[PDB]
Design a binder for these strands. Sequence first.
RNA 1: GCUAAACCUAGCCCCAAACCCCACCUUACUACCAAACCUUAGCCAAACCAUUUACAUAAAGUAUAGGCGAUAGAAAUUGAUGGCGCAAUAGAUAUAGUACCGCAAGGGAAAGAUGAAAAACAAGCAUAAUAUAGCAAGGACUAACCCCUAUACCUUCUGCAUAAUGAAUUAACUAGAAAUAACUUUGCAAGGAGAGCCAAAGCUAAGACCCCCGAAACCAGACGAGCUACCUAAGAACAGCUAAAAGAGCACACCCGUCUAUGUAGCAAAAUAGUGGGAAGAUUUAUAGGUAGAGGCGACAAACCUACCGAGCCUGGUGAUAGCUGGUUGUCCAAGAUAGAAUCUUAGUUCAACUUUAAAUUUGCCCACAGAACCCAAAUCCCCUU
RNA 2: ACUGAACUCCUCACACCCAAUUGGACCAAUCUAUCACCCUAUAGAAGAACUAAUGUUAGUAUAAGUAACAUGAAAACAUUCU
RNA 3: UCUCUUACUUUUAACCAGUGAAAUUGACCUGCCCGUGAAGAGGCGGGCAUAACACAGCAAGACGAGAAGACCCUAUGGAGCUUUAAUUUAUUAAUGCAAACACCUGCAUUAAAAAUUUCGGUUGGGGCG
Lengths: 49, 166, 95, 16, 91, 117, 26, 190, 97, 243, 45
Amino acid sequence: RGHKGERQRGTRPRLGFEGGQTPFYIRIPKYGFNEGHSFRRQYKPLSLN
Amino acid sequence: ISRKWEKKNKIVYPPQLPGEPRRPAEIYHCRRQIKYSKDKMWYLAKLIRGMSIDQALAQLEFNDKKGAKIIKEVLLEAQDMAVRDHNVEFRSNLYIAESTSGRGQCLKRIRYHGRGRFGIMEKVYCHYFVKLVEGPPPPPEPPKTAVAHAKEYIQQLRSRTIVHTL
Amino acid sequence: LTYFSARKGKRKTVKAVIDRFLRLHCGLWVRRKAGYKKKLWKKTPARKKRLREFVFCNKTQSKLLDKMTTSFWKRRNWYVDDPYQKYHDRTNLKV
Amino acid sequence: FTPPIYQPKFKTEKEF
Amino acid sequence: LRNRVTDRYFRIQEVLKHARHFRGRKNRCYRLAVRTVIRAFVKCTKARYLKKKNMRTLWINRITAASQEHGLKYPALIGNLVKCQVELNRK
Amino acid sequence: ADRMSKWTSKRGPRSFRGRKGRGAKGIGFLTSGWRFVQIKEMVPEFVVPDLTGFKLKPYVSYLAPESEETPLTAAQLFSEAVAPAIEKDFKDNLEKYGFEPTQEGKLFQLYPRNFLR
Amino acid sequence: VKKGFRAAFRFQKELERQRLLRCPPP
Amino acid sequence: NFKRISYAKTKTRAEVRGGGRKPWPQKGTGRARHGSIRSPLWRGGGVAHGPRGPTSYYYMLPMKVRALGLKVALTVKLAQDDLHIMDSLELPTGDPQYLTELAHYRRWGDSVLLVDLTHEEMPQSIVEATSRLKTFNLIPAVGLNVHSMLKHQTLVLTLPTVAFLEDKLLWQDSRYRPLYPFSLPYSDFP
Amino acid sequence: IGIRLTLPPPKVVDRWNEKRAMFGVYDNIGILGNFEKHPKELIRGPIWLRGWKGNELQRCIRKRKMVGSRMFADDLHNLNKRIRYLYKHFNRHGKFR
Amino acid sequence: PLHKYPVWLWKRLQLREGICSRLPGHYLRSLEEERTPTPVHYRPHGAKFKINPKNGQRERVEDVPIPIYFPPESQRGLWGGEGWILGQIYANNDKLSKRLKKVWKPQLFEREFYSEILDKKFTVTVTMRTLDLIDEAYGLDFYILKTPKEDLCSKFGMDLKRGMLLRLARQDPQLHPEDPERRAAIYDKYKEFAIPEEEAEWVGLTLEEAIEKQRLLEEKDPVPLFKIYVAELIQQLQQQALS
Amino acid sequence: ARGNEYQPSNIKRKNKHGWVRRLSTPAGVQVILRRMLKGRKSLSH
RNA sequence: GCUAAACCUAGCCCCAAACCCCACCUUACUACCAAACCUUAGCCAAACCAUUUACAUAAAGUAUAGGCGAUAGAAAUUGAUGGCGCAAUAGAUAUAGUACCGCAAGGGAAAGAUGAAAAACAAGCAUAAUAUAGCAAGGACUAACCCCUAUACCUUCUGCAUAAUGAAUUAACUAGAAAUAACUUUGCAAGGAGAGCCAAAGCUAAGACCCCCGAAACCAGACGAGCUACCUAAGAACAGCUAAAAGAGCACACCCGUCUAUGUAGCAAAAUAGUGGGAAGAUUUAUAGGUAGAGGCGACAAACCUACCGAGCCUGGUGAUAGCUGGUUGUCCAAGAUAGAAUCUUAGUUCAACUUUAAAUUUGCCCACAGAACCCAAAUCCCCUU
RNA sequence: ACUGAACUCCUCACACCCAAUUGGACCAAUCUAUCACCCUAUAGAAGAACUAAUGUUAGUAUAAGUAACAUGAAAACAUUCU
RNA sequence: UCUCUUACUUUUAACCAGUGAAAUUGACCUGCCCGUGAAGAGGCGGGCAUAACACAGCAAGACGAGAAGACCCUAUGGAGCUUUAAUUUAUUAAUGCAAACACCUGCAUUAAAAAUUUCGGUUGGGGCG
Ligand SMILES: Nc1nc2c(ncn2[C@@H]2O[C@H](COP(=O)(O)OP(=O)(O)OP(=O)(O)O)[C@@H](O)[C@H]2O)c(=O)[nH]1
Ligand SMILES: [Mg+2]
Ligand SMILES: [Mg+2]
Ligand SMILES: [Mg+2]
Ligand SMILES: [Mg+2]
Ligand SMILES: [Mg+2]
Ligand SMILES: [Mg+2]
Ligand SMILES: [Mg+2]
Ligand SMILES: [Mg+2]
Ligand SMILES: [Mg+2]
Ligand SMILES: [Mg+2]
Ligand SMILES: [Mg+2]
Ligand SMILES: [Mg+2]
Ligand SMILES: [Mg+2]
Ligand SMILES: [Mg+2]
Ligand SMILES: [Mg+2]
Ligand SMILES: [Mg+2]
Ligand SMILES: [Mg+2]
Ligand SMILES: [Mg+2]
Ligand SMILES: [Mg+2]
Ligand SMILES: [Mg+2]
Ligand SMILES: [Mg+2]
Ligand SMILES: [Mg+2]
Ligand SMILES: [Mg+2]
Ligand SMILES: [Mg+2]
Ligand SMILES: [Mg+2]
Ligand SMILES: [Mg+2]
Ligand SMILES: [Mg+2]
Ligand SMILES: [Mg+2]
Ligand SMILES: [Mg+2]
Ligand SMILES: [Mg+2]
Ligand SMILES: [Mg+2]
Ligand SMILES: [Mg+2]
Ligand SMILES: [Mg+2]
Ligand SMILES: [Mg+2]
């Protein structure tokens, strides 16, 4: 478990935390990549092969 | 707890052949749970180790320690049982081969101290053991004389070998 | 994140990741460049063009996003006219 | 100040 | 107490048997015996170098004694034997 | 500080000790000046019978035959006390046979019981 | 008491060995 | 293992009775710091990492894997000459001594697992004989399993049981993906 | 002295008592019975973990969900506390993230 | 261990056991049945489905009632299902601000109401909602007889309901004595609410009150065994005489 | 100087920790209920 | 050979099934006199904190909510015969909610072992004190010591015999719980799976992976004014002398506690001896009652509120939290040590760098010429051969 | 010249000397399946291993037979005396 | 009190007899000088010394034993207090507008009273950053 510190104490920060620096997964702007994904229609492909 | 000392009187040896030295008698006696520190009892035990029964009784009769009276009673009981049951011909022909003091079962009490604190008093009890062997007391180990002691030195010199070689 | 939800005992998804990143089924994560909508009046055309692009993520960043999102977001989606359908798979990749 | 602590009494009022 | 150790007696004895000849509580108390037993074994291991070192020193001293009894000095004796191709060692 | 020992009249201060009793049933009341007025009717009167000529004894000879216990029941008592009269009068208003509509008016009311033992 | 048989058997063997060493048979 | 449900459980420091107050202040007492008389370090305290509640060990191997295991067991018995095929389990008498003597004479193992097609049609003679025997166990065809086949030295099968097992085990080979549980109706599955 | 001075009473195990002899029978009830019964239906035990497995937190959640209403007062309080503590442990403590 | 039944079914089990079992069926059914009260402090959703503007999808919507606290004073009056709202607010109506405990209380008025069926004038602490409901029902008697228990939400209101229903069921001449025409007119006007007296007796009774009523109904000083044995012996003797 | 804070008096004892006072308020009734649930021999002082 | 050692069953744990005479609310256990219902909060997480933060299967961790962040999170729809438990420091706290502790709430133990019949080897010591010199042993030796070699252990450290921490010692108990994606091993295979889910060799199953003790604290509900602060009712005490009607003087009882000495685990968790202030008053004091903790009371000393009050005590949330301290238990082998950046951040953490493991294929290092700036040295980089 | 290492050679044998971390081969004891039947084997499991937490409980040491404690005198044990 | 301390009595004390704790304690076969060293050594290097043990004193050392001392610093630890620190007015007191025909309720505004929470970092001892 290492020597002292949060990692040995078992209390290191949450995943995605960067020690107080604005995390990577939050400094990227929000974009509608997955907007309405649950409402987009999906069709299984059926190749002629 | 252990009570082997009492059993030690119940060992029966096989009959001795006529051409065999007479086996000296041996009597194991003890008193259990004496209200006396085993450390204090040990001094009396050591005092009477190796002495004749009569000499030990005389020494204990004029000793101021409380354990002296208890040891005298134990020795008198040992003498009585030795004569009655262990076929010891003469009362005085007995010497204390072994005499030791053993720790007994003790009780814990509280001693109140000054500031609401306390200590654990121990109501100390001790056992006392004696073996009486028939026959005159063994002679005291004579101090080694210069002759024998230089003999030992010369033997040590002769025992030397050429170490760490063929 | 929540490694075990209190109601289902399942692993939860950091919806902040879903709101920001697109996962190609191959394993690549796509993102917009930070500041692509900020103070464009003081940015050169080359800088604006660089910012307006869709950019892949590092190996470690992709691993972080995969940990932060659950398996539902890592499935095959046969959407009707997905602009990223071609990009969902890798071709001629050697190691 | 810290108050003194008393142990349980049975430990000391045990008897044969 | 699903699983309890039952061999601790023998685990202790394995160490205490090596400490039975020590002094003081080191031969009875395991907490103390184990430390000394480890030190005893480490010394035993490191002493194989010193045994060889002292044997050569002892041999050199004895050879010097004899060569002085014959009026020679150990360096002269050893060097001249080597030059004579007498490959006798110090032991 | 003694919570376990029973609470008696020997424990509290003078007022407590005076007030609490030992279960002895009261005999009267207290008037002005703490003068106790004893009511004669409140004193239980021991109705001791004349034992002269009585043949029974505290013990019974072991020679007596053994019998089967048959605890008395309301039905058995009715059969043994009322049934004969009822039959004799029917073959030929229940107060005639013994029944009383209400215990009120009786010195020894059966319920609520108003007599000792 | 500790459930098990192997430690007890080993201890019995050690006791037997010590008893034999203390009072070897004729 | 899959049936196993260990009922072992221990009380954690939270579930142990009492242990709410701090045994003594942090400082000044001269004793080790403590927060409750029921922490794992204390005598009578909770168990830090002990068995927790009734735990299940349930897991399912693929039905193809389980059928393959049954097949492998049958092949092993046949190859090792512990598999005996019978026309029927009918016995001349329901006396267990007869069955034991027959097995001993035919050099069957100390343990025999007899299998019949269905529970209802099993002959009364063999039923009576095997009801009083410990090492001779009679089971229906549906009850055949690797564990019992291995535990019993010899395996006795009737011809109908052989046909039934062949059909059932081979059906696993050459079957589609399950569109839905096979308990549900299928075009060709009884 | 943590060693017993006498051999423990001999432990005789009957390997051919009915339970051991018939152990495992009908484990193939499904594949050998037209799949009418799933083998997990042969499992006898607590209702909330019949044919289901999970870590302690999942087990506690399932117990509360399925028999929480029928639990005793203090047992249910202990289960709620255990669920809270297990949530905290599994979601905030550990070597990895 | 585990209780055989869920703890929340213990009340129903206790209803099915004991004097509650002996309670009349209609009253037990009235207790068991529970209907959601009419919305008062919240606007119900128009339909069961809605097109949420965020994603333009048809989503189900449910009407979750606001918990209402009814202080004991309400049981002595007629509040039209209105009560205290014990909730919380965000200072300045922005969630990023502080959260404060807020109690909304109805405006209570003292008003006098005349009951035609009871021919009595009652002074009652009342709410404007109750007045509006009375106006809609076209009178206090109509309001009482129409409003169900849940919507009425008042022990005094339910007692008034029981009184009116008993009056109707008995056709009591005590309603405007020496005026049979007027009494008949009133009874005809409120005819539609008439129910059997055996049922009207138990309208609006709490569980404890119903238990007390049943206990008083079924309490009988035990018949002396003298009478029973006399009857049995007379019957047996009659049988013997016949045979 | 300290330690003897207890100056016994049965009147105060009963008026402060008696059965009547414990039943006087709902809280004390719950005190007695807790003692009964725990099985205390002495429910009230 | 003493102390002692052991033992097997008292019981308990998890499931299943099944729904369980008299006295006594007054001072309880005393024979008998004219009035309930009303949002939990807080810790904690967000690395602070202020909005916020969990209390059958599948859909699905999806739609949604959210300082849109920590996290929270549906619904439509689907249909659903016991112990690889403990066995007296364990298992219930339990032999018992007893003893004992506290005014009260409340806290809360320990331990027993023969027989068919009782009408039969730890430590510590002693046997046996001790011989120059030395981490107490090792090499040895004929020989215990003598001779030569040897700076206890753990933890924390750049570095500890260190005169840095812990440890008297024996026995017992006492501390790594798990998803994601990987890897290995099977099964089947463009399909896998016992509905749902995944699939551009996948899929199913298994194996393997994440500790213990400790705060001051916060909130909720109880219990406390038999101590003490103040007050209420109705009581009591104040010798003697002087002065006369005194918040007067000297000085007993009484109250207090100026100074000194003793005591400092004490006689005492605040005392003793002497000395001293008041001692008819705003005095001292017995009895009962009252004020209760985001409160009381206070001639304000932040005094007192049951010996530890800048905010009581008990229980509960609670196994609070702790980037801090300490601890983290079988054998053996192998690889294995520091470029930096950001951070309410420098006692920490994320990334990078270094390191480990497994796999793929192909150049890696060393390095000959040639080559790398004008302004205004050592060397380095690149680099075929080798 | 000689002395001088765990450097090197020599006879034999070789995985057998780095903190954190990481890989691997084994394994004490317990229970379960099946063996075994003077103590075991192949597997499955887990409250699975203590020279250390001013660790908890119990025992006994050290300080230490130390600090500390106590009974006015004689006597006929009637009594008297200080 | 002291120059300047002395004499005696009691207690304590020491010995004999009974009873019998506490902090403390890694193991100890527990020396001095110089040097060395995590920087002031009984334990390491070079010298010196050195039979074995009790008993009574002493307090120079064992950086002596007692409270994870006193003092200082740190913690995205607390808590008490003050405020023109931030956020509020849930609560009371006022008014105003509604509702009803002064009281009650709802909504506003102003105060009093409080409540929650915080008090960044690197540098600077004789400053005024
Ligand atoms: N799993 C489990 N089975 C139990 C438990 N108690 C009893 N049984 C089972 O109950 C069954 C019947 O017990 P018996 O004593 O033979 O009969 P019984 O007295 O009629 O049984 P019950 O009606 O259960 O009281 C047996 O199979 C027992 O093993 C229990 O606590 N758990
Ligand atoms: Mg550490
Ligand atoms: Mg005291
Ligand atoms: Mg608790
Ligand atoms: Mg326990
Ligand atoms: Mg007083
Ligand atoms: Mg926080
Ligand atoms: Mg126990
Ligand atoms: Mg010993
Ligand atoms: Mg040290
Ligand atoms: Mg330190
Ligand atoms: Mg120490
Ligand atoms: Mg008072
Ligand atoms: Mg006077
Ligand atoms: Mg005066
Ligand atoms: Mg005052
Ligand atoms: Mg001041
Ligand atoms: Mg001050
Ligand atoms: Mg206090
Ligand atoms: Mg913690
Ligand atoms: Mg290496
Ligand atoms: Mg910042
Ligand atoms: Mg050499
Ligand atoms: Mg080498
Ligand atoms: Mg363990
Ligand atoms: Mg140990
Ligand atoms: Mg320890
Ligand atoms: Mg001693
Ligand atoms: Mg001394
Ligand atoms: Mg003394
Ligand atoms: Mg003495
Ligand atoms: Mg020095
Ligand atoms: Mg001395
Ligand atoms: Mg030292
Ligand atoms: Mg400190």
